[PDB]
């Protein structure tokens, strides 16, 4: 449940190349596990929407034109090399627990998603978690706004309505 | 269907008066149950923050609301049965004895529809466990394109410096 800082991300991407790099970008964009991202086919990307299939239930996550352009243009990543990815990751983040390299980028997506004001519920869906309790590992990263009781109530913080 | 629409709210408030109206406004603002709102005292409102006592929890309100409800017990001329009658007239299909909670559900429901956090809602409602609050989860928009803009690459292909 560790994650990469902004600066760790920067180093990671600088140090990777080829399909590993593209996969990293995809995982950082979508919260994909390494495996499901690496096995991805052209047909799983329709109108800038990536579909990770049934194995864990299916789920779909949108990506920018730029990302879609870069990763697509059969299997998208035939020259993926997980061990080299792992090596490079461990070099940037030495304190990373064993075999957690498959999930580090997923946890980085999630973590920054919450830090940046994302909804825990939307995140649950994006990650394809069956239960919200799974997604609550990222909850403490969220800012909390009790004054939303005022502005989001159905009177909009007033006395009237509408 | 468990809660009041915007238009049902409008009718309800138009049709109530006196302390009932104020209580309704308070429940719609805070997710208060009828009872805990009706039994509220001046001392439970400090700096535009309402405290519902013994599990206790505190919920902020706008100046306007505080001004209106706090000029002892705030609502000595409350009349629940009249409230109930009026509610039933606006929303006939409302389940039995649910009139005490209809406004709490409407607060919660709109809070989520309007983009509120399920976690914050948990705290506001004073739910012990998030699972209790997940009854309102399906009302949340799921703005999947936030996967793009809230990315650690900000939807791009690369890092910043
Ligand atoms: Zn209830």
Contact predicate A60/A54, CB 8 Å: no
Token pair belonging to B86? 């009026």
**If you measure CA to CA, which chain A residue comes closest to B25?**
A159
Mark yes or no for CB contact B147/A61 under 8 Å.
Answer: yes
Round to whole Å and give the CA distance between B65 and B55: 24
Instruction: Please name the helix (run of DSSP H) or strand (run of DSSP E) that holds residue B60, with its range, or none.
Output: strand B57-60
Header resolution in angstroms: 2.5
Q: What angle do CA A108, A114, A117 make, to 5 degrees?
A: 140
Q: State the fold for domain B1-161.
A: hpI Integrase; Chain A (1.10.443)
Query: Nearest to residue A105, comparing CAs of A40, A37, A22, A32?
Result: A32
DSSP string of A63-98?
Answer: --HHHHHHH---BS-TT--HHHHHHHHHHH-TTPPT
**DSSP 3-state percent helix, strand, coil across chain A (nearest 5):** 50, 5, 40
Residue-range domain boundaries for chain B: 1-161
Tell me the angle at which helices B18-30 and B102-113 cross, rounded to the nearest 10 degrees.
40
The CATH classification number of A1-162 equals: 1.10.443.10
**If you measure CA to CA, which chain B residue comes closest to A114?**
B150
Contact predicate A24/A101, CB 8 Å: no
Q: Which of B13, B131, B156 sits opposite A64 (nearest CB)?
A: B156
Breaks in chain B (C to N > 2.5 A) come right after 54, 71
Round to whole Å and give the CA distance between B23 and A12: 57
DSSP reduced 3-state for B37: helix
Mark yes or no for CB contact B152/A6 under 8 Å.
Answer: yes
DSSP string of B84-112?
Answer: HHHHHHH-TTPPTT-TTTHHHHHHHHHHH
A69-100 residues labelled b (16+ CB within 10 A) or e (exposed):
ebbbeeebbeebbeeebbebbeebbeebeeee
């Amino acid at each position: 449940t560790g994650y990469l800082t902004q600066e760790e991300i920067a180093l990671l991407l600088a140090a990777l190349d080829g399909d590993n790099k593209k996969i990293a970008i995809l995982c950082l964009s979508t919260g994909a596990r390494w495996g499901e991202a690496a096995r991805l086919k052209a047909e799983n990307i329709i109108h800038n929407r990536v579909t990770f299939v049934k194995t864990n239930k299916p789920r779909t996550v949108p990506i920018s034109e730029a990302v879609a352009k870069m990763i697509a243009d059969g299997f998208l990543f035939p020259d993926a090399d997980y061990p080299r990815f792992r090596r490079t990751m461990k070099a940037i983040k030495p304190d990373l627990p064993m075999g957690q390299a498959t999930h580090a980028l997923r946890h980085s997506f999630a973590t920054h998603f919450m830090i940046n004001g994302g909804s825990i519920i939307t995140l649950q869906r994006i990650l394809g978690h069956t239960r919200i309790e799974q997604t609550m590992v990222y909850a403490h990263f969220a800012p909390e706004y009790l004054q939303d009781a005022i502005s989001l109530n159905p009177l909009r913080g007033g006395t009237e309505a509408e």
